[PDB]
Design a protein around this ligand. Sequence first.
Ligand code: MG
Lengths: 59, 212
Amino acid sequence: KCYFPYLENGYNQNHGRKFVQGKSIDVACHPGYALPKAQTTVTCMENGWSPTPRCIRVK
Amino acid sequence: GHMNQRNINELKIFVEKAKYYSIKLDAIYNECTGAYNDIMTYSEGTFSDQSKVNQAISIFKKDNKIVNKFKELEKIIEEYKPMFLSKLIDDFAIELDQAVDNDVSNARHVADSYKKLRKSVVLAYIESFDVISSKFVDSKFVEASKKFVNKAKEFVEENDLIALECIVKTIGDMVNDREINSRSRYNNFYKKEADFLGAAVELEGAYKAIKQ
Ligand SMILES: [Mg+2]
């Protein structure tokens, strides 16, 4: 199972939940932040979440 | 007269020297946010993969890279540096020293120390502007600067990096004779943005009355 991480500057409704392989999750960041490359969903895969959820500063 | 020009000169020099402050603090934030998240996940919940937490401490510690990025920001405001900034850099460094490889017992302390230091970087920019604007003779500008400082600090407590971006942009526009953008650029999601920008408009009016 993949543990959904705490998200600095994100919406944290899924923090600490764990999910089976293949599960998708919506990720939302606060204004001024975003997942890289505008992505909004992550999927639990063999090596963890793909892509990696994290709320980076965006211009 | 002569002193007002020298005050304006001192401000413009500070603003130019510190113009990368938001870009550089955002750069630290982006490199570290995944690591910060992994530590918080481990410390707040049942997630137990210590190898991830060790890799996260490594981001904050390795080659003193992140410490040196903070020291670089300290050097930019050297002439005005607050004692609380030097103290919080040292506390970060001490918590990093306590972390030995494969020991994650100090992980939350490292994350907490980093977060306090990151906010204090923004506060140190504000404090530097406070020091400079306090030396102005014009009472209207002095008063408007003090209100700008206090609204800025309340913004920082809500979100440090967004506040810094707004502060750096607003003061940069003002001293480069660009009209201040007085509308919320972050959806009014940050409740303190509106009162900051109102104080920025009043500071702009006071600055232009001097500049004339
Ligand atoms: Mg400790």
